[PDB]
Amino acid sequence: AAPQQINDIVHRTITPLIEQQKIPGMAVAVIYQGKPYYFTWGYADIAKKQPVTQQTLFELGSVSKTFTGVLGGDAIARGEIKLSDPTTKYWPELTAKQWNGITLLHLATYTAGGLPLQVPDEVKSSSDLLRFYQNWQPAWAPGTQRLYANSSIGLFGALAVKPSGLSFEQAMKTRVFQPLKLNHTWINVPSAEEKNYAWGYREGKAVHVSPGALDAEAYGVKSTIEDMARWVQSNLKPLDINEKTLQQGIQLAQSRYWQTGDMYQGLGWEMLDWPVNPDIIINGSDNKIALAARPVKPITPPTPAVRASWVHKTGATGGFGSYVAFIPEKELGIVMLANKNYPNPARVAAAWQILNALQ
């Protein structure tokens, strides 16, 4: 069991959320004074009456970008890449003139100048990808507008692993998942684990995310509530991580590279100063704002990770909705995994109500 205050706020917050949003299955972890407390509701498979458990795998959707950002941070710490490196250093075939001046930093932080939200479904092979990026015309100069984009950070992740000689999946397993003992976190779910893979539900139909180019880097990780609680713990307290470059990569992913309004862009993670205005984070998570182009101000040098921050990331696929938020100064965090893609503001409002009650 958990402290009664945790049980109380979680039951009082999540129960009406599930009823109002018609969520079939949900798992929540609260990290309180560094320790995890787990809660499950509902079904991973409705028709087959399989309950959500602490071993159920959920599609994290864009929460995957936090792993990509940390893996990139680890590569920086290893001396393998620098964020100021030009994109063309790692992909010399990207010869089109618009790529002159676009750095890894711009890719990682969605500031390359209008790379689109999605890689087109028609783009599958590395030859298709090259044609896509060679034909793309920026709307803005690099480093002026943030436009959230799988095609931007997805390319960052693919290029950041090139010096290592490893595939993106192998780099992620060897350099992030394995050192942190994330033993049930997968880019590709093995056959033997399919029994634990929840179905997502979209308009009442059971669905799983479809393959797409750069999916692993941008939205393709599946994980359990236990592994996600450990991921939060690791990002809350990197000084407990023994592998020095991973410790440093976690810190670098919470550095503040750009500001827009009151939010700061990290590597994958986004941050605001704590205490936050809850209306700012709730309303800012609505796709009307979160997917819009917004002007950025550079932070030179990037601010080293600030402990008194609200650090967070939403994620979705067609059938799933996920949210992670944590406050390093308070040793406090939350993971919310659900097998329905329900509106971002409802996730953020519930998470803030829980964490604010426990601060």
Ligand SMILES: *C(=O)[C@@H](NC(=O)Cc1cccs1)[C@@H]1NC(C(=O)O)=C(COC(C)=O)CS1
């Ligand atoms: C990040 O979470 C992101 N999801 C993906 O790009 C991965 C997906 C694979 C299949 C469907 S989404 C954002 N999620 C969503 C969503 O609500 O699912 C978006 C909504 O898109 C528009 C347009 O409103 C944007 S991409």
